[PDB]
Symmetry: D7
Subunit: 34 residues, 14 copies
Amino acid sequence: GEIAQALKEIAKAAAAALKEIAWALKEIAQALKG
Amino acid sequence: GEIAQALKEIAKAAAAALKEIAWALKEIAQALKG
Amino acid sequence: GEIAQALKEIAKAAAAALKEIAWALKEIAQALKG
Amino acid sequence: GEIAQALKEIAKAAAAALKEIAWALKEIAQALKG
Amino acid sequence: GEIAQALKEIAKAAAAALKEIAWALKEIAQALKG
Amino acid sequence: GEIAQALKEIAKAAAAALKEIAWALKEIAQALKG
Amino acid sequence: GEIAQALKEIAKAAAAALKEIAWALKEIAQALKG
Amino acid sequence: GEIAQALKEIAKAAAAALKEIAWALKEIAQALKG
Amino acid sequence: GEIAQALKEIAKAAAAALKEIAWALKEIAQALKG
Amino acid sequence: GEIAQALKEIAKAAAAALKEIAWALKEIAQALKG
Amino acid sequence: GEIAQALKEIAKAAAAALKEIAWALKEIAQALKG
Amino acid sequence: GEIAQALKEIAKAAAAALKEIAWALKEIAQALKG
Amino acid sequence: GEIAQALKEIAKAAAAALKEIAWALKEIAQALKG
Amino acid sequence: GEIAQALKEIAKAAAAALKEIAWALKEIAQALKG
Ligand SMILES: [N+]
Ligand SMILES: [N+]
Ligand code: NA
Ligand code: NA
Ligand code: NA
Ligand code: NA
């Protein structure tokens, strides 16, 4: 159904963008170690 | 449908804004490297 | 519809506030670079 | 309707709390300036 | 209704946890001030 | 109902994980203190 | 049902990604501790 | 809410029209009873 | 909830009007019995 | 909203067609009266 | 869930009242014998 | 949306079938006149 | 899903009861024929 | 979606059953002519 599919698009989009934040934070950690 | 369309707008707008956060965090990492 | 309108309000409000977070993170990067 | 009103409450509660985060990040930037 | 009540629970739980993030960020600012 | 229960799961899961973020931020504050 | 399942997927995907953020912040704390 | 109000409109319109059918059938009974 | 209450109103209104139809048909049967 | 509007269309269409049934029953009563 | 239970009530109430119509029609059939 | 469309299908299918009942009732009235 | 299943129960229950009405009308026809 | 499919099932089942009622009524008309 179109509603369920849109809800899955939220899951996917939100998760992917949150993981980008996590990767940027690892970059902060590497900068601090360097 | 309109509910599905609005849900997709949440996915798009939240993802885009979270990616702006990720980018600002990379700016912080770059400042910490020097 | 009213449910679709309220979902759009979530999209707008969340995106705007997340962008304020990104802008604040940029302020942190500026402070580190000064 | 009650579902739309609860969604609006999500929009309001989330936005207010995310702006609290933005403000705390401004406090970090201010701490770094000082 | 139960859907509305569950949405209000999202609002309440998310806002409270986001405020805990804001507080922890204030603790970072305070550590930097010291 | 199953939709209400799934919303409650969003509330519980999101709140728990956001609290994990708050705790990790407090560890950052502690590291800055020491 | 499919809407309930999609909502559970939001819960799981968001909680997992938020946990990755928390871990990355622990990594920053470790970097700051030396 | 708008969905609830539309459902109430189904209840009202359907009941009123079904009552018209019952009245018409009473007219039939009256015609048979001469 | 308001949607469930409106659906219950459909059930109640439709059943009561359908029973008026059944009653009018009984009246026809009795007119035909003489 | 489109769901409310569709529900209103059910109310209108069903009511109108049930009234056509009631009218046809009145025609039976008329035929029985000569 | 309360919406599902209300829909089941429509099913039950409408079916019971329609069966009352069927019984009344059988009474007409018996009167015509007859 | 698909739910709205399926609701419009109920309105259409129900109204058409109910009109067939009304025509069949007119055929009874006609038979009674002869 | 439970809502979809409840809607299917409406379809089944109403169709079966309406077919009982059709059968009783066939019994009226037979009584007239005899 | 499953909800839209179940609504379509109501449309189909209800139409088919109502047509059976129309056909039985025409049998009554024919019995009356005979
Ligand atoms: N801000
Ligand atoms: N027949
Ligand atoms: Na849908
Ligand atoms: Na500042
Ligand atoms: Na569903
Ligand atoms: Na750590």
